[model samples]
Target: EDTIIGFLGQPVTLPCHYLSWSQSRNSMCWGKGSCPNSKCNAELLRTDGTRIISRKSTKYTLLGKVQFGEVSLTISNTNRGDSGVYCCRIEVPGWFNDVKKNVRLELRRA
Candidate 1:
């Protein structure tokens, strides 16, 4: 995992890779939270390629897209509230229809 830093109003990209060791299957998801309140949810984040954010949740703003195995979240216009644990969960289906993988996101301001 690599660490990235950005200014208050600048753009920042959060990168994540999702692929099992066997390379059989892969299901990835993203969620963001500002500590006290969870701004982003798993269900709400997997909307579309163009806009990965759920419209229902005001806090769930569409920053950018997560292409291929590289889930890159783009924060167009950053704010102070956009600082917290932005997690990327990769659910890999098992033999009995079970899923696993919970990737966490770490963001910091400069």
Candidate 2:
């Protein structure tokens, strides 16, 4: 688990990464609320740096640096409502290494 503090109206990132010997098709997603009951909050970028979102919004973005084993999630225009625990779920095909990490956000006034 990780804790991140951000100010209202500022941007914040929840960090996550994985180690793979070679690049392959992967799926990832960011969510809010607790695991197993969380809501998908952002479209995750695959290893190829492509994502599919029903509606695109610049409010959220993947770091797109998976080549370096980075899959961080960035949120813009942070607000009080964003103060909570966030989840990063990762899945790699053919590997039983699906993982999820939680990041707690603490928003403060500027």
Candidate 3:
């Protein structure tokens, strides 16, 4: 994914989505770095295909349609220190069947 420019005090969403799956329940997770072990690293939040299972902070959220595979993460109250690479892992309901993406955010002063 291309780098996204985020402004301080503003909210930013890192895009990560996919389709083409059949009728099945697939969960997802968000983390604060490149993925590892076929999973997200330093995970901030996780979803169970319908709702959130756990989260690290209130600032991290999934503002997308989680039931429809829109697992993007929204970071509220963005700060300069928030600039970094974020990762998301969408489980596809099978062994080694998972989707992952990395988003680089460059925080800037608004």
Candidate 4:
């Protein structure tokens, strides 16, 4: 995965989308680091695939159309501690149907 540069005090976005229109809008979550066993680890935010369930902070929010399969994550006011790997886990309903995306965050001074 390529690194997403996040400027200090600026918002940064990490993108993830599902193109399968036939699939159900299942639950999904964002976590720290790569996904383990097709699930989230150190979960930061969660959504019922339609609405947000929980989030680490208000800064963590979906930037795209969540109802249309665009679950892009945007973090506001990027900080030094925000520089790290982030994982998006989409729990598809089936065996090995989960979708996982790992994105690296690199914070830089403006």
Candidate 5:
């Protein structure tokens, strides 16, 4: 993973390119893992062009949409609290159950 440096008052964006294991699935899940079994928590920001979920004041903005077999995240106005690990999990029906892509994010003041 590459590192990103930003000024304290400036805004930043963090994004990830991801794909679902199957196209037959209809939903995608994004969460921040705080433990082996517990998710620190995150919200789904938008769908298509409409807002699906509101961003938490403490966490980075989480966006999700299923396209073909891909999922993407766009986190804006990065803050210190936004620095952490994120995961994208896909949910499908009657297949293999679930899948995820774990990403590590760090924010540096420069």
Candidate 6:
């Protein structure tokens, strides 16, 4: 688990990355609240760059940098309501294990 601090009205990226992982034909999801055991309430992106908004919130985005192993979640115009726990889960086909990383966001008044 990691904690990230951001200012209200500013953009923040909750960092999540991996090493020696083949991103090809993979599925990644960014969600709010606990992960792995819980379903994502935000967006899901595939290896082909396809994005699906499960919760349909415009505040979240994938930043399109997953090719470099940076599947960070970008929050635009951050606010106090955005403060809480977030998660990044990734799955690559043929891989023995899946990856799930959590980030705790702290939003401060600007």
Question: Residue by residue across 59-101, what tens digits does model 2's lDDT show?
Answer: 7776556555577888889989878887776765554455767
Scored against the true structure, residue 41 in model 3 reaches a CA lDDT of: 84
Candidate 5 weakest ten by summed lDDT: 44-53
Model 6 residue 17 lDDT score: 69
| Model 4 spans with C-alpha error above 4 angstroms | 21-25
Clashing pairs in model 4, backbone N/Cα/C closer than 3 A: none
**What is the per-residue lDDT of model 1 for residues 6-54, given as tens digits with 9 covering 90 to 100?**
6776666666554332223544445654211222353425433222434
Per-prediction TM-score to the true structure, in the order listed: 0.53, 0.74, 0.89, 0.89, 0.55, 0.75
Model 5 lDDT, full chain set: 0.48
**Each candidate's clash count:** 0, 0, 0, 0, 0, 0
Instruction: Mark the regions of model 2 whose C-alpha exceeds 4 Å error after superposition.
Output: 37-56, 94-96
- lDDT (CA) for every model shown? 0.46, 0.66, 0.81, 0.82, 0.48, 0.69
Model 3 bad stretches (over 4 Å): 21-23
> What is the full ranking by TM-score, best candidate first?
4, 3, 6, 2, 5, 1
Clashing pairs in 3: none
For model 1, the superposed segments whose C-alpha errors exceed 4 Å read 19-24, 33-44, 47-67, 95-110
Model 3: lDDT of residue 54: 90
lDDT of 5 at 21: 39
TM-score of 1: 0.53
What is the per-residue lDDT of model 6 for residues 13-69, given as tens digits with 9 covering 90 to 100?
Answer: 888765544545655777777775534555433333344334346666767566566
Candidate 5: the clashing residue pairs are: none
After superposition on all CA atoms, how large is the RMSD of candidate 2?
Answer: 3.5
